[PDB]
Design a protein around this ligand. Structure first.
Ligand SMILES: Nc1nc2ccn(CCCCc3ccc(C(=O)O)c(F)c3)c2c(=O)[nH]1
Ligand SMILES: Nc1nc2ccn(CCCCc3ccc(C(=O)O)c(F)c3)c2c(=O)[nH]1
Ligand SMILES: Cc1ncc(COP(=O)(O)O)c(CNCC(=O)O)c1O
Ligand SMILES: Cc1ncc(COP(=O)(O)O)c(CNCC(=O)O)c1O
Ligand SMILES: Cc1ncc(COP(=O)(O)O)c(CNCC(=O)O)c1O
Ligand SMILES: Cc1ncc(COP(=O)(O)O)c(CNCC(=O)O)c1O
Lengths: 459, 455, 459, 455
């Protein structure tokens, strides 16, 4: 035994699963707005010897020795991160050690806030993420709501865009220490200048979690939150199309004074201390390297053309079913995802997702503003995944037809069934649907296989 | 742009940095006790298309859809995790989603304890890890000391072993809700039975963090903490020789008028997600599953047996050459060397050994508060390169030459950065270290290296 | 030395101060809404041998011995408390050990809530009290806001009455565990049925702090909060006209169930444990006795006539200066105090209070809804103090004339000065005012001395 | 209705209850160590018109108006408070607004510590007070254990004294921010210097809670904790013989490149008001000021001297009659009697002594966890009734008869409530206790009683 044996020779039971997952990725259509297909150059670094190196600390200030090479890789990842988002290395710094998106936000809270300090984020059913501070009415769900006190800001159930009105008044009542301007299911843009002026009034930190729109900000397509926020966290996958990791961007340098006083930003040393030694242990240098590869790809003109494509098909998604029997919350989209309101078409979110999944269309249910209730009303459909397969507008309008067909299968089964347990049932029971779904899935798998796919060929 | 371009073509700047680290690992003597060389089979899974799948939730209980095979992969990782440690699936469950060892420990605290509940682990300078609750006398350092109240227990400096007596004394006063049994720098076997009795007396959960000794535990070469702990966490690298990830083993079934069940499973799984983490790193979960099957093989038992032999051979070689060992020797994978009787501190030795491609780390000795005067040396990394007992005896020879080089420089320097700069500016000390480094690399390059050939 | 020597014989320096304070009490007019003049029967018990007894615990469940007599005094205080507010001793219990009003509320929070649990109270500048959870924008002021997380509910700056609208929406955002329906500077009534229905929606405890309107609820004049709240705290002075102490009323017995289930209230054992042994030590049995005396006086027809008088002069206060050059927030009063808005008369709160004090009219500045800012706009004027001196409507309309004269002295000095340091200055500097105030104070002291005064004659 | 009616006329039900307690105090032997008989002069101030004045704030810094003389009264109480303890007004300030001793301690924690900061006091069964942080093994009992994290230090059971060594050992591990020096049941003098060194080492505030010994400290008959503590709290009753209220003494001026000042004054005063309390009990503040001037007199020094003599006379009388004393004897105002060697527990003795008008309280002995087997007896209450050494020797005689009555009943009963009921139902034990009670009351009534005659 040497450890250099191939995976296909040593673990065939596993190797069959990697290929089965790779096949299904190429089999169907990925419409989850948070998913994407990583490049072979990044995964080549992800599965490298950099997994073997323990490099606790930071470049130049390690605790072990022998970090000569990983120090240059971390510094290059930092330079490529500041370059990808057009940041002066004197006005901004970046921490590339967060294991994923969730640890990145928890590190920002630990660095700048005390336990049980106040936090305001967009609620989870209103398009927010768990790590933005989510409690139900029974249990504290996210750990961000256990170690800190979180009050959600909602948004106008008629506008579809976040209620910067109600956020302003309640920020003066709740008196938060930090407000998160980030979204997980929101098809429009964020007024970060509005978010900064409410934060400056109640004196709260404005943290931007551009996790979903990271690649779009990098390609300078949509307005960048770095002009208004002081701290920016993000995912390294999603639109950035990299390995699973996180990044914490923080403002650095002099912020502002009598006739003689320099008043510097204090984010850097606190943020870096929260990541290590407070929260995380040994960095995942293989992930940091894979992120640096994906960040370099984000500085290229290819990535701007890819980013400019995720919107035009997001609009093509919005136009294709607005010109069908569907309405969209907020009234379309200005980013990468569409929030199709299946309520005015007599459908629910849990209904369509199970149907679309069985025909190899991966989606997820979303709670639209006028949804009520487990059976939400709306679906979450994204662009960046198929756009990385060289999908164009005509290709996305055809998927909408594949979706519309799947919806009208569910809408036909729903009127022939009752509850959700009977609906998700009859999707696999009724023989009239047992091969109507198979006939569809057949047409859907052949349409999807013909497109290219980033990464390795067989895994 | 297809996204299928190779790394050497697409990003030549990063491809070379990859190969530079590969050469550094192949040419150096990796003695960091927490480092190992992951197999190529696992790395193939680590850098696969499983990075692309968002599967928030658990097998069968996924929030989204399309996780058909990812559910099979995570379930396979769990089955191999319990098999690797001879665990009854009816008495033990495992969470395979912790991003690393530090998240695994934070998930256990968030699941079982309320904020500011009390935690007891071995003090960091005494051999405990950061995530076992560590505060300095000036600052709360570990987040385990911010969200929870930690009080450390200490070694008996006379013997270098854990002071199980003083732990029992202070646990009755501190009344902790959870006590951590697990070390980062400890050459001896933890008395898990004694820890269990202390936890039973003060009504505390016993958490075993076997991150450093997990591979040894899986190979049944040292006593298993599963026979005494309710919760067991571990890293998946180190002696398990896998990708970087975490595991949380917990008790299941009935604990003990009349059926008091265990209440760990769903609290632990809820703390991992949705409380603390987001999407699981399915590529890491798969690479861990590949490593876990390797841990069930007879090959891994003989390797773990060799790790113990190599550590003792390294320990015996140091003793015969006039070195002091904390706690007198070792019973696991690492060796704690006390360099104070030889005349050099761990800081100076760590820098000298690093410049000759020998990677160790300074280690606090019982007594010092002070610059560290010890050194922690591990066997599992080089043992994966087919090192044997005679090879580690030769490693101690290279270490002994490095110590005396640092000894002669200390006599020619005052402050520590005068010492560090003297190893670079001074022309002799430069070439004297260049000859030792070359002899070290020629000796290390000859041994095989797990993983890919080029990166 | 025996300890039985008189105070006038053993401590003449002190004895002179007791008489000086007694003289000034009879000298001037007490218009502080929270103050009152205690009866001689209560103070006789307040300065008794009951100060010597340590009786930690509760009747029947003491920790020491020899509590045979104080147990009957505590039980009688409990019976007289439930009788004074017409409570079924099966539906309500009372804890008579709170040292004062502030400890009473802190005990309720400790009993029912966890540290950093959420609390909603009326803000201090909006008429609330400190113990209702008051933070500034720099420091956490009240300890209730340090050990618990408090978000204030404000009230319509045009209505004058608490904004049950904004309280309802923010209670669904803040998700509090307990909401306090109590006031310190609020001239109108509280819709406790509105307060209960918002508490039932967000599932929060409704605590009523009737500290200011305790005597009015006891005399069954104004609506009682005990019909809507589960926990009621109060002061034993203020309108109850007793010694300084506090009381915690809690609901007791079965609250509600399948076909067989009794679901009891759990307030009693928690509330009693928070008072002792959690927060307080040895009870002040001399205060408990003095409270029981004052509570028995509250069950009498005399107290209803006294209570019915505190409002008619509160209205007479409201009418007298509404029919002068003054406006009142909320538009008058329905309880015992008036909140005179001195803004539309060109006056401030800090201006009039210092002027009225120097002529022996004790008042306090209050922040009216349209006040801005240290120099608030409005004054807090109460009835129960002088009403206990057998004051009637014609007597209160004359004080308003004494007030109006004092205001027009300040309004004349304010136009002759500038800031507050110069205003409070020229009140004692200008000789035209140095005896205009002395001539007034002379007429004010003779008008006030002629009225009776509860308590001892000389101290 | 004028409000000037007497209590005997207005409320005859309460007036009689007042006189019933007065007779119980005059006829009983008050041995509760924390009880004293307040003078009539102070009670006149306690039940005065100062109950009517709301003066939220501090002298000169009042939020309202009309506190002209109340400011003079509070300032006079402060001047007498520092004079009573020989304190330089430039080095010490005092807050006279704490409603009692428990609020005084909570105000110190709220002022100096953040929520969940760490507190160390002597354990309750070992002689510490509730407000020094007390949790059982099942529940946080004291609010000082809810808003802050308390860990107790313990007596050395071999000697009955505070284990200053183990306190130093556990303070280094627990790292408390404030350590409390002060007891409720402790017959010996606290080593405030040793407490100070432990606090200086772990960077903790030393809080001295002298509630039980304040009168002795004021009379300079025992060492003053002000020579070693930064914060000193006390009740105003007990040995100070005043009304029920609290005091917080704190350091002022300069504490120690170059003028590091003390930072207690405004933090302490802010915690009292507006943080914790509302309107001060000016009637209590005045009654306290009357008592504080009494504490500065030569009369109070001779009374405090007699308190020590009476406690030793009580202690010696118990020893000669075959009783055991925790820590061998006493150096202050109380005596801790161990009744386990005699064959009776404190619970049974406390009930028997109560039925014969002898008021003591059961007290845990070092070792027991168990029903208490000891008894705490205090001297300051009866010493205020002009009791002398021979009178306390007679008190021990009455106690000795009560113990043997309880001993014979224990031999005729099984459970504890069988014992308690036997003292009431059984006709002999009833009349045997009636004869002792009558002899106790005839002996006690003869001594003078401070306060009013009738109430
Ligand atoms: N025994 C043991 N050894 C090692 C070697 C690496 N690590 C974790 C990395 C050390 C980080 C650190 C160490 C000490 C301090 C301090 O402030 O003194 C600190 F602020 C941060 C450990 C460990 O956690 N424990
Ligand atoms: N040494 C000392 N003696 C006395 C005598 C009275 N008090 C305070 C009243 C005791 C309340 C108490 C005591 C014990 C427990 C327990 O749970 O064991 C409890 F839940 C409540 C004290 C004191 O605080 N300390
Ligand atoms: C016992 C123990 N537990 C948890 C962790 C955290 O695991 P990650 O670093 O993978 O998060 C470590 C890291 N090991 C520290 C060392 O090198 O000694 C550890 O040694
Ligand atoms: C806005 C946002 N922020 C943070 C995270 C956390 O990232 P990790 O799960 O990699 O830790 C997510 C994941 N969101 C998943 C989804 O929307 O489907 C996210 O959408
Ligand atoms: C040392 C000490 N500190 C504070 C307090 C609290 O004081 P109040 O009870 O006045 O709040 C007490 C009460 N004494 C308890 C006993 O009888 O032993 C005490 O003994
Ligand atoms: C509504 C209310 N509640 C509680 C308290 C506290 O009571 P003590 O101060 O007796 O603890 C006050 C005192 N309020 C004083 C004022 O309004 O002037 C109050 O007005």
């Amino acid at each position: 035994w040497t450890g250099q044996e191939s995976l296909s020779d040593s673990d065939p039971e596993m190797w069959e699963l990697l290929q089965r997952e790779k096949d299904r990725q190429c089999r169907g259509l990925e419409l989850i707005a948070s998913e994407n297909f990583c490049s072979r150059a990044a995964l080549e670094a992800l599965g490298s010897c950099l997994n073997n190196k323990y490099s606790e600390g930071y470049p130049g200030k390690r605790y072990y020795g022998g970090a000569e090479v990983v120090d240059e890789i971390e510094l290059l990842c930092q330079r490529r991160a500041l370059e990808a988002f057009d940041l002066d290395p004197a006005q901004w710094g970046v921490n590339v050690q967060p294991y994923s998106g969730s640890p990145a936000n928890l590190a920002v809270y630990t660095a700048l806030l005390q336990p049980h300090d106040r936090i305001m984020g967009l609620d989870l059913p209103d398009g927010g993420h768990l790590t933005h501070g989510y409690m139900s009415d029974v249990k504290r769900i996210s750990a961000t709501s256990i170690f800190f006190e979180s009050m959600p800001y909602k948004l106008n159930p008629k506008t579809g865009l976040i209620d910067y009105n109600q956020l302003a008044l309640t920020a003066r009542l709740f008196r938060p220490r930090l407000i998160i301007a980030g979204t997980s299911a929101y098809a429009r843009l964020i007024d970060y200048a509005r978010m900064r002026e409410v934060c400056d009034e109640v004196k709260a930190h404005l943290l931007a979690d551009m996790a979903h729109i990271s690649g779009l900000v990098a390609a300078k397509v949509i307005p960048s939150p770095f002009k208004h926020a002081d701290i920016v966290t993000t995912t390294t996958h999603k639109t950035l199309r990299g390995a699973r990791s996180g990044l914490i961007f923080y403002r650095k340098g002099v912020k502002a004074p009598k006739t003689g006083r320099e008043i510097p930003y204090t984010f850097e040393d606190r943020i870096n201390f929260a990541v290590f030694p407070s929260l995380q242990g040994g960095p995942h240098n293989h992930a940091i390297a894979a992120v640096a590869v994906a960040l370099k790809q984000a500085c290229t003109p290819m990535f701007r053309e890819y980013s400019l494509q995720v919107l035009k098909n997001a609009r093509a998604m919005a136009d294709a079913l607005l010109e069908r029997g569907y309405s969209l919350v907020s009234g379309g989209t200005d980013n990468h995802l569409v929030l199709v309101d299946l309520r005015p078409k007599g459908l629910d979110g849990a209904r369509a997702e199970r149907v679309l999944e069985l025909v190899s269309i991966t989606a997820n249910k979303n709670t639209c503003p006028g949804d009520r209730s487990i059976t939400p009303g709306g679906l979450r459909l994204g662009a960046p995944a198929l756009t990385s397969r060289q999908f164009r507008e005509d290709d996305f309008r055809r998927v909408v037809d594949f979706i519309d067909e799947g919806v009208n299968i569910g809408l036909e089964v729903k009127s022939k069934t009752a509850k959700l347990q009977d609906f998700k049932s009859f999707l696999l029971k009724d023989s009239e649907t047992s091969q109507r779904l198979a006939n569809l899935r057949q047409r859907v798998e052949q349409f999807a296989r013909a497109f290219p796919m980033p990464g390795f060929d067989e895994h």
